[PDB]
Amino acid sequence: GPHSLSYFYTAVSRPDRGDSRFFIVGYVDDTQFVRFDSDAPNAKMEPRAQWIQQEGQEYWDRETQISKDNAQINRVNLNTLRGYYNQSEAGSHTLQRMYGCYLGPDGLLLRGYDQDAYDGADYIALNEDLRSWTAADMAAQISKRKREAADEAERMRSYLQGRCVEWLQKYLEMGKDTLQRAEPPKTHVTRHPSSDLGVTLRCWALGFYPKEISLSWQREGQDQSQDMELVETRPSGDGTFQKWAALVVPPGEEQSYTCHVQHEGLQEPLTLRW
């Protein structure tokens, strides 16, 4: 799939203290490369990838500044929205934003995006053409009118089309060894026989870099996905992922089943049996 640079903002109101807490994480594809946390003492934007550590104080001074400004503005956004919903000061609330650019095949923007959510409900999205907003309710209509009066949809469109893509291309270069190399899954089958219930065959894939993978089980030249248990792809915590698929088969039939693995880091689709 095409490369992506994405930023994820979370604000939480803290009414015990009458203040807020603010997080950002930056991603290129499935690699976190920066964070910020407004509760950190002398809070700054910190690298979370080796290949970004090299950036000078000039880079960190700008991101840290944006982060602090956003921590301040996002405090009052939470107050604003609480007013729009005529809500108590009792409760905690969350305001999320995400935005980013995909890198098209002719080195231009392919699909830029930008969206917000109050208490996990869609509030506003920038439209596909990036020249207009869609608002989910009466409160969101207030925010949308202000953004329209401020011509902010063209500011986002210029950013997504300009800086976002450009810095995606720079990051992809800086981290090409990790970011552009596909690690194929290390795979095996495990067998767990039971009292009197059938044998469980588990097909493991571990240490693959791009998150996207397909596991399936087949018997004699027919798919079996129908009754197979498939866990959600999970981080290994070293930047790779893992996944397994399991099914129960009659005692003695274990070699009648093959696991099929599809991942973009393999030369050919792969076939496993216990």
Binding site: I24, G26, S143, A150
Partner: peptide
């Protein structure tokens, strides 16, 4: 690098 311009609620 991040967006630095207005995002009004």
């Amino acid at each position: 690098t991040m967006y630095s311009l207005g995002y009004i609620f």
